[PDB]
Design a protein around this ligand. Structure first.
Ligand SMILES: C[N+](C)(C)CCOP(=O)(O)OC[C@H](O)CO
Ligand SMILES: [Mg+2]
Length: 394
């Protein structure tokens, strides 16, 4: 009871934008109120808190669930299937970007609505690029960047790195694209492929950049380490574009990831959507979908996108006057939009296999941190994952 409880992690440092969308929602429906709740510092903390709440009584009305947690909770049956609610509220689902809404479809039903959606971006420091003699653009291939790497490392010097790789908090997501660009994958649908020769090749490229040629390092806060100049470049979310833009005292570029052979997609989408706990009453499920649909309407997804660097989730958001000027005056904000139709759906091992991402991410960090053998590390992870698969299947 009481207001609509909105549990968010304020992704992209977006709490101010969310308070503002709440204002728009309350002027539009003077009858309903919202309480924005700082439910956690990242998607894992929000999901942890939701888990605890489900065993209890006080469940939120609206909860932010990332590209892994929505499926975990949907498959657990704790989330409202929304397809009939879309019709009852008048949601124009044809207007959401189709790939972004299909990201939440499970067995014919949708269990969340896209909200803070992203692609990774190749951020690069332009002063470093100029010092190294590079052209003003991202690498076209990870092989080309392997040639830039040592040149950048020389100009940035001793307490800096040409490239920062994310730590376990995000490496499974940022390494996904390069893996694809090499023709690898964690898995192909449910079949694991971490020990295919192309996946290992991508692994060794990552390992060699840190321990072989030594122009790359495993970062902590990758966005801030890039913005403060410690990393000459990094793959991080477009969701961090506003924060990086506020802190960086140098000019910088954002580029799409290197594609695969013959421009085959080599970039994931990511981020989170809004969902409604199944154990709410039918009235609160109505108001909750009212809210979710409002703050993700054309004008409002355009606004949230302007404040963060995330993608507008509605096709017609680019019909919005402010969004056209914004994209006009902010080219780095175009990059994720232009990249969106060159993406590839995420490997099942990362997003759907229960516990898969924790295992994959640890393997990748262990490779990065201590230079663990890649073939050995990938074999052990794939065997521990295959154990999961065989168990859940049974
Ligand atoms: C909040 N931030 C930007 C610092 C990190 C998460 O970035 P996202 O693009 O929201 O998610 C990426 C991925 O799908 C998560 O599994
Ligand atoms: Mg409450």
């Amino acid at each position: 009871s009481g207001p609509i409880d909105f549990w968010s992690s304020h992704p992209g440092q977006s709490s101010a934008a969310e308070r503002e969308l709440i204002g728009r929602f309350q002027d539009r429906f003077p009858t309903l109120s919202v309480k924005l709740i700082d439910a956690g510092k990242d998607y894992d903390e929000v999901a942890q808190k939701f888990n605890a709440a489900l065993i209890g009584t006080d469940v939120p009305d609206v909860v932010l669930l990332d590209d892994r947690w929505w499926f975990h909770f949907a498959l657990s049956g704790v989330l409202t299937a929304l397809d009939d609610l879309f019709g009852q509220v008048g949601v124009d689902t044809t207007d959401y970007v189709d790939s972004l809404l299909a990201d939440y479809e499970f067995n014919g039903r949708h269990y969340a609505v896209p909200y803070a959606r992203s692609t990774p971006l190749f951020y690069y420091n332009k002063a470093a690029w100029q010092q190294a003699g590079l052209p003003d653009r991202g690498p076209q291939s990870w092989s080309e960047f392997d040639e830039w790497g040592p040149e950048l490392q020389r100009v940035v010097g001793a307490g800096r790195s040409a490239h920062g790789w994310a730590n376990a908090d995000l490496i499974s997501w940022t390494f996904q694209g390069p893996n694809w660009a090499f023709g690898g994958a964690y898995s192909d649908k449910w079949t694991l492929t971490l020990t295919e020769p192309a996946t290992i090749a991508a692994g060794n490229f990552y390992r060699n950049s840190i321990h072989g040629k030594g122009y790359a390092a495993v970062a902590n806060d990758i966005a801030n380490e890039f913005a403060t100049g410690i990393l000459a470049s990094a793959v991080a979310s477009t969701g961090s574009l506003a924060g990086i833009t506020a802190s960086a005292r140098f000019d910088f570029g954002a580029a799409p990831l290197p594609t695969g052979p013959d421009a085959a997609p080599a970039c994931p989408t990511g981020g989170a959507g809004l969902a409604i706990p199944a154990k709410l009453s039918e009235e609160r499920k109505v108001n909750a979908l009212k809210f979710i649909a409002f703050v993700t309407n054309p004008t409002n997804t355009a606004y949230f996108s302007q404040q963060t660097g995330y993608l507008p989730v509605r096709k017609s958001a680019v019909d919005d006057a402010s969004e056209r000027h914004y994209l006009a005056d902010n080219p780095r904000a175009r990059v994720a939009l232009d990249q969106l139709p060159h993406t590839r759906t995420q490997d099942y091992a990362r997003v759907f296999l229960p516990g898969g991402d924790r295992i994959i991410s640890a393997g990748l960090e262990s490779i990065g941190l201590r230079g663990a053998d890649v073939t050995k590390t990938f074999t052990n992870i794939q065997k521990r994952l295959q154990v999961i698969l065989d168990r859940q299947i049974m």
